[PDB]
Structure 1
Amino acid sequence: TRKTYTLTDYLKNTYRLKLYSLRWISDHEYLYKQENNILVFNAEYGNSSVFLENSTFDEFGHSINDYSISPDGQFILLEYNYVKQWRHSYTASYDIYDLNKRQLITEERIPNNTQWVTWSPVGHKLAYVWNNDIYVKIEPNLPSYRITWTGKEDIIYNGITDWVYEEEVFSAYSALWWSPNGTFLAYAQFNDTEVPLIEYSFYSDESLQYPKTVRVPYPKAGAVNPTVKFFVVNTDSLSSVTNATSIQITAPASMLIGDHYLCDVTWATQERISLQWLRRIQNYSVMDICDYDESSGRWNCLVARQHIEMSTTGWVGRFRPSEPHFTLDGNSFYKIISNEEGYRHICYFQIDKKDCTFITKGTWEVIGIEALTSDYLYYISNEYKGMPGGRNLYKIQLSDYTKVTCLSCELNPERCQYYSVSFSKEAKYYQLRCSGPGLPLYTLHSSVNDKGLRVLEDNSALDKMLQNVQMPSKKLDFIILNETKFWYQMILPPHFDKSKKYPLLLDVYAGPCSQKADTVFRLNWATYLASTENIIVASFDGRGSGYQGDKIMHAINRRLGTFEVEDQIEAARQFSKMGFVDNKRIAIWGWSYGGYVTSMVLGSGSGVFKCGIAVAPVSRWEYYDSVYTERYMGLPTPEDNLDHYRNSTVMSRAENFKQVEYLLIHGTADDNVHFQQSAQISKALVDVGVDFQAMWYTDEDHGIASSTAHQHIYTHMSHFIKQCFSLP
């Protein structure tokens, strides 16, 4: 009898999934790390060489957290002293190593505690943010040029984002953009002067006698948001003037009438930049295309080149307006937008014409535009087999839209239905990354003829190990509700037997544009629960889920805490009606948005669930951040949508928690979903006399990802689940 996939296996990573992370440094060479050694590979022949021996920094006196080679290969940026902050932000120290002279630079070093640094796209110019101010170095060993003087901790951010812009808008800490050949440096400036502060205690190491109070500007729903400004400085003039001028590009009149956001920055050419602005009521965005005026050194955006993008049924974009992809001459661009049927497709735009032309269509959607050459546009979509949970790479002929080739569909249809792609500098080569439903597979391909060059990593090692293990199986299918298909997936125990009644755990996220039913292969907690505990773990994408058209995604518009909650309850009913589910043992759990939904479900009084676990849940929308909350709920005022804000809290369903077993967990240093949210749930439960289980994690954030806490929380949830299901 083969062993099963146990909890320890999951927590200890005994069965390691291999990947192949490469970095294109040109149109046909990439870097790969093998044995702490940085090797350079020739894509065409697969032959390589040592780019940087591991023994190169033995006597550095510091552990190098990451590296970055300048575009011209002349220098390398060494990052150490990594200090994590939020999801993407962190501070670190940096040193530059001169590859040709093989000497480490020791003059005019990058300051310690630098918030962000990036090479220019070409050459070896450097731009970094320190103490909230931007600096540029034309040469690694020369003095820096200061670009801004207004930077102020927690107040003015130049070149970097504030908490909400980092988390909800740019998904990055940096807020600066080098133009294509590096002449100009554009950046955003955020002013959080009047933004309220979230405050919580951080206890730190046992040696700290007095707890520290963390204070970060964070706008909750309906609160004062940060204002923003955009500028562009010409770095080429830095060595000719004492103080180079940052030219401001003001937002359009349609945005200045009220609160708004800068939501996208994309350079089109060396002298044309595009910007998208979004109104605080996120259903109206504007794109300005601005050209450099050489005579006045100013930037002008002709209204004839201004493009409007709005929505009548919801917000704009899946999570925000999509990014434009310009043709070489910068006179036209491709952008994904939802069509008249509500499906997201690629529209072709002339920069000075408002009507665009869709180049793809159908009851499926384009996930993203991956590359654009003078002849072809490549993109990933879920068109194949009508599976919204699948992903494939396509190629469309620019001179004939009826010519579309699927570059990955048939490569290995039984093992690979979820693809990701990585193109070389000029798209001459591309690495395909298959992540499911079989073992991940990485392959390298040639664009000139779309031929497979070779297999980079097939995970044979793991496949070998997984042979002596009773692995669970995965079922991806759908059920029909109101003439509409709704997908679900099930992690089934080994030797599944449909004649038996298995306990069921509904794994839920269910946030707007989410997708929990897909063809991806994962080794996670559900693997253990299904393999060792013979527990069926299920997920369901109901109303509000993504990649299936706006009719489904925008169904929860201004109504969070309703349909996506009910549909989840309905999904459980349908499952127990499949005959292999023990209706007496049905649980539900989720994290983040999932915790909210789990809590809302447990408080519905449906009688369908026996117990449930919520990890770091939202409890009332007024406690979450403005950008994300208002996108779906509008403003919490009586003139807008306050009644629903008050009607969709977890606390108001406290009395119904008497019918179930609840486990509430939250990290105390959670800067995203504040502990406050679970503190209010627990108080509501205590207030109506409801018993439940709770667990706080000291100094842990939204991810509760520290190694020990990660193991502690899943171990704790396992006991609770096993107990609720009466499992030995």
Structure 2
Amino acid sequence: KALDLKDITSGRFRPENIQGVIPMPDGEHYTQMSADGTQIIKYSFRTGEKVEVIFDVNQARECDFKNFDSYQFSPDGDKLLIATRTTPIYRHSYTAVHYIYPLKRNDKGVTTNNIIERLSDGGPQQVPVFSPDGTMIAFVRDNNIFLVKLLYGNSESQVTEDGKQNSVLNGIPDWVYEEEFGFNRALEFSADNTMIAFIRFDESEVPSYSFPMFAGEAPQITPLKDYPGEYTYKYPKAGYPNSKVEVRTYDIKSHVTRTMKLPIDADGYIPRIRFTKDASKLAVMTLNRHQDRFDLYFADPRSTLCKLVLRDESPYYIKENVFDNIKFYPETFSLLSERDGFSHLYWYSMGGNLIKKVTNGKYEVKDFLGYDEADGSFYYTSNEESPLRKAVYKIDKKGKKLKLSQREGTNTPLFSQSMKYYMNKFSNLDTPMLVTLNDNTGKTLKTLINNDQLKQTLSGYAIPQKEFFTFQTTDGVTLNGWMMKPANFSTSKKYPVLMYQYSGPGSQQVLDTWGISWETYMASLGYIVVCVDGRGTGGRGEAFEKCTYLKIGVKEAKDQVETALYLGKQPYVDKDRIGIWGWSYGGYMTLMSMSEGTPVFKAGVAVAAPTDWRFYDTIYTERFMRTPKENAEGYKESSAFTRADKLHGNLLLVHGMADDNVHFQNCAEYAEHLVQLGKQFDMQVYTNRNHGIYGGNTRQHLYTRLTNFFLNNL
């Protein structure tokens, strides 16, 4: 009956789902890994029926591994590439030991008894990728590119030889490009399988950063039991130099390497490369350092000449999410753009001329899912119903729009290769997770998962319920929030309040989707829990998000104060027992809101918080703030240091000491500022932990610490 935090932290209430869903090249089937990671099994998109087991570690020949982590198909589906021993590096990068598995059917009529072969005889590999004809795989290892020719006995050749850790990266981004342009690979085959292209990152002049590593626990780093070690990598802080970047091509036949003569500012960016359907056209996406001029080039991989295809210019900045929504077709390509104030889908000719604006209106297109070359329909997700929701839509060749989603909430689709079917994952405030198979019209073909068991289990517990609300700030802005109330709620009682937020640019926490979290636990203890997405958050167009430009944090903190004030006007909240907390930008926002000047907060917890933007990285910080050289006044007003003497309420600072994202420096420097100001506060510092602060009992310990801090300090 009573909600138990350990059940929350252990994932007891995580809804059933399907992991490792990979659509097959035929457009009719998908595959999924079995629960134990022993098998890859093929299922029908049209019916959900199991077709056959495609791969099985207990049937494959020469298979030394017990489990695998992930897999991908070759483009024609005749082979699998299977990843084992996946070892994360940063958020998106990792190494793994990959294996090639052919799917030819055997004497007995099964595909499961074939010989598995190593991708490489050397060490683990990064970002392997098939050629369009499936005859080659390129991968990166020790910052160099390698090429394996599957029709040549898996013969391996070395494409680059100047890769050097902390100096030169070939085919993979450095830390800041990876985190802030959100990708792990800059390595492409041309459409006729004759050229490789890659970005070469010269980070030799980027500043290095190092932090200590101890032995710790979960995992214990046993070589460090007596003397600590360290982790060193290149990380440019705001205004410092970024990697020098070049686009290079490798002629597979002739072994010749060339550099594309790309017009680009000396301090500009290349967020992505992508070969088109035209073997002579490599797309190169570029940004200026202000990140407000997105210039798309077509490079000839042999002549090295580049032509400007289009420029998308923002009055503020271009956002990273546009880059992976550019999909190339014969004769056309897609683009997401906020040029009219809202994220919308645009359809261009391969000559760079706009063919049509596919979507319009005061809502945001979230994902471009694809163009059906058969009938000319476009598929995409959008929040047209409401900033809180997401639905699947289709627009036919004549401009007719159809909402495919059957239920209102959060619909996440996964389309078949042919766009004929898709798997839908649906959630809302009281629907944990419904997984369905659907046709092109959105009609439900089969319910795979309804999580009735979880629903039954949860029925025996007293679970506080989320509800949405809106309110108007004193200057007339309407904000979306949710409120979770304790059991036996009464408007004649007086409740303490915990505010949760994240508040970062373009982000949203107030969404019609299901979850049980530490906030639910606090509500079960008798707290009213509230989350409001203030100004600067996403879902509501460019004007709402980018009104923070060049002076972030300030308006967001005002809107959190406004939220506390609105709550204080309610007869059932105790105005003196309002707490606030958050993680990452939400931790920074805890600091900014508690030192805003309006003394509304009794207590707060800041987890892994940036405290001065000069400590954070170039691409993210400068996107919103430009450089400290150009915007000293903005950095001043956005710093938590500047307003620290106005800190009001009992503060707990939490940080992982091995945080490669928001450096522990942020906490150490800010703590010392508070010491010299004479402010008293609490700390919890986690050994060897990164931005996610997890491992072993860490998460349970942390949320118990947060629980007790608010119990004691509210």
Shared topology, TM-score over 0.5? yes
Equivalence for 1:230: 247
2:385 is the counterpart of 1:358: no
Equivalence for 1:329: 330
Distance of 1:322 and 1:207 partners within structure 2: 41
Distance of 1:476 and 1:182 partners within structure 2: 52
Counterpart pick for 2:484 among 470, 491, 510: 491
Equivalence for 1:538: 530
Compute the displacement of 1:687 (Å). Answer: 1.0
Compute the displacement of 1:44 (Å). Answer: 2.0
Distance of 2:513 and 2:32 partners within structure 1: 24
- AA paired with 1:652? T
Give the direction of change, closer, same or farther, for the CA distance of 1:614–1:108 in structure 2 (3 Å limit): closer
Give the direction of change, closer, same or farther, for the CA distance of 1:495–1:361 in structure 2 (3 Å limit): farther
Counterpart pick for 1:153 among 165, 181, 201: 165
Q: CA deviation digits over 1:317-368, x for unaligned, max 9?
A: 3656563233x323x333121243x122122323435566423221211112
Compute the displacement of 1:182 (Å). Answer: 4.3
Q: State the secondary structure of the residue aligned to 2:693.
A: coil
Distance of 2:292 and 2:161 partners within structure 1: 35
Distance of 1:486 and 1:163 partners within structure 2: 35
Q: State the secondary structure of the residue aligned to 1:669.
A: coil
Q: State the secondary structure of the residue aligned to 2:198.
A: strand
Distance of 1:528 and 1:720 partners within structure 2: 14
- AA paired with 1:422? L
2:699 is the counterpart of 1:710: yes
Counterpart pick for 2:214 among 195, 200, 203: 203
Distance of 2:172 and 2:485 partners within structure 1: 45
Contact 1:318/1:513, CA 8 A, preserved across alignment: no
Q: CA deviation digits over 1:234-255, x for unaligned, max 9?
A: 44x2xxx4xx123332322xx2
Give the direction of change, closer, same or farther, for the CA distance of 1:428–1:233 in structure 2 (3 Å limit): farther
Compute the displacement of 1:516 (Å). Answer: 1.4
Distance of 1:392 and 1:436 partners within structure 2: 12
Contact 2:144/2:169, CA 8 A, preserved across alignment: yes
Give the direction of change, closer, same or farther, for the CA distance of 1:115–1:59 in structure 2 (3 Å limit): closer
Range with greater deviation from structure 2 (596-605 or 679-688): 596-605
Matches within 5 A, 1:384-463: 384=385, 387-398=386-397, 400-401=398-399, 403-408=400-405, 411-413=406-408, 417-437=409-429, 438-447=431-440, 449-463=441-455
Counterpart pick for 1:91 among 88, 92, 95: 95
Contact 1:194/1:224, CA 8 A, preserved across alignment: yes
Matches within 5 A, 1:321-720: 323-326=325-328, 328-330=329-331, 332-340=332-340, 342-352=341-351, 357-374=356-373, 375-384=376-385, 387-398=386-397, 400-401=398-399, 403-408=400-405, 411-413=406-408, 417-437=409-429, 438-447=431-440, 449-481=441-473, 482-530=475-523, 532-637=524-629, 640-657=630-647, 659-720=648-709
- AA paired with 1:138? K
Distance of 2:660 and 2:477 partners within structure 1: 38
Contact 2:261/2:304, CA 8 A, preserved across alignment: no
Q: State the secondary structure of the residue aligned to 2:511.
A: coil
Range with greater deviation from structure 2 (59-68 or 120-129): 59-68
Q: CA deviation digits over 1:548-585, x for unaligned, max 9?
A: 11111111000112101111111111122233322111
Q: State the secondary structure of the residue aligned to 2:642.
A: helix
Distance of 1:64 and 1:317 partners within structure 2: 35
How high is the sequence identity, in percent, across the aligned residues? 30
Contact 1:157/1:191, CA 8 A, preserved across alignment: yes
2:282 is the counterpart of 1:273: yes
Q: CA deviation digits over 1:410-444, x for unaligned, max 9?
A: x234xxx1111111111121111112232211111
Give the direction of change, closer, same or farther, for the CA distance of 1:684–1:380 in structure 2 (3 Å limit): same
Q: CA deviation digits over 1:591-634, x for unaligned, max 9?
A: 11111110111222321000000011001100000000000001
Contact 1:285/1:321, CA 8 A, preserved across alignment: no
Equivalence for 1:188: 199
Q: State the secondary structure of the residue aligned to 2:40.
A: strand
- AA paired with 2:282? I
TM-score, L = length of structure 1: 0.90
Equivalence for 1:9: 7
Counterpart pick for 1:132 among 140, 143, 164: 143
Equivalence for 1:60: 64
Distance of 2:320 and 2:491 partners within structure 1: 38
Counterpart pick for 1:298 among 296, 303, 324: 303
Contact 1:266/1:324, CA 8 A, preserved across alignment: no
Contact 1:120/1:182, CA 8 A, preserved across alignment: yes
Equivalence for 2:110: none
2:206 is the counterpart of 1:214: no
Contact 1:202/1:214, CA 8 A, preserved across alignment: yes
Contact 1:157/1:189, CA 8 A, preserved across alignment: yes
Give the direction of change, closer, same or farther, for the CA distance of 1:496–1:104 in structure 2 (3 Å limit): farther
Distance of 1:541 and 1:669 partners within structure 2: 29
Give the direction of change, closer, same or farther, for the CA distance of 1:368–1:76 in structure 2 (3 Å limit): closer
- AA paired with 1:276? M
Contact 2:101/2:117, CA 8 A, preserved across alignment: no
Compute the displacement of 1:121 (Å). Answer: 4.4
Q: State the secondary structure of the residue aligned to 1:55.
A: coil
Q: CA deviation digits over 1:443-499, x for unaligned, max 9?
A: 11122x543211111111111111111122111232234444321112222343333
Compute the displacement of 1:59 (Å). Answer: 7.0
Contact 2:175/2:235, CA 8 A, preserved across alignment: yes
Equivalence for 2:218: none
Contact 1:315/1:632, CA 8 A, preserved across alignment: yes
Distance of 2:188 and 2:494 partners within structure 1: 57
Contact 1:668/1:697, CA 8 A, preserved across alignment: yes
TM-score, L = length of structure 2: 0.92
Distance of 1:291 and 1:54 partners within structure 2: 43
Distance of 2:54 and 2:349 partners within structure 1: 43
Contact 2:504/2:585, CA 8 A, preserved across alignment: yes
- AA paired with 1:15? F
Equivalence for 2:268: 260
Contact 2:199/2:273, CA 8 A, preserved across alignment: no
- AA paired with 2:44? N
Contact 1:95/1:104, CA 8 A, preserved across alignment: no
Range with greater deviation from structure 2 (96-105 or 207-216): 96-105
CA RMSD of aligned residues (A): 2.2
Contact 1:38/1:54, CA 8 A, preserved across alignment: no
Distance of 1:480 and 1:556 partners within structure 2: 19
Contact 2:369/2:381, CA 8 A, preserved across alignment: yes
> Aligned pair count?
689
Q: State the secondary structure of the residue aligned to 1:609.
A: coil
Distance of 1:495 and 1:422 partners within structure 2: 41
Q: State the secondary structure of the residue aligned to 1:144.
A: strand
Equivalence for 2:296: 287
Contact 2:213/2:231, CA 8 A, preserved across alignment: yes
- AA paired with 2:643? R
Give the direction of change, closer, same or farther, for the CA distance of 1:501–1:182 in structure 2 (3 Å limit): farther
Range with greater deviation from structure 2 (537-546 or 613-622): 537-546
Contact 1:111/1:130, CA 8 A, preserved across alignment: no
Q: State the secondary structure of the residue aligned to 1:151.
A: coil
Give the direction of change, closer, same or farther, for the CA distance of 1:4–1:592 in structure 2 (3 Å limit): same
Give the direction of change, closer, same or farther, for the CA distance of 1:333–1:90 in structure 2 (3 Å limit): closer
Equivalence for 1:41: 43
Q: State the secondary structure of the residue aligned to 1:600.
A: helix
2:308 is the counterpart of 1:309: no
Q: State the secondary structure of the residue aligned to 1:435.
A: strand
Contact 1:71/1:124, CA 8 A, preserved across alignment: no
Give the direction of change, closer, same or farther, for the CA distance of 1:483–1:345 in structure 2 (3 Å limit): farther
Contact 2:75/2:130, CA 8 A, preserved across alignment: yes
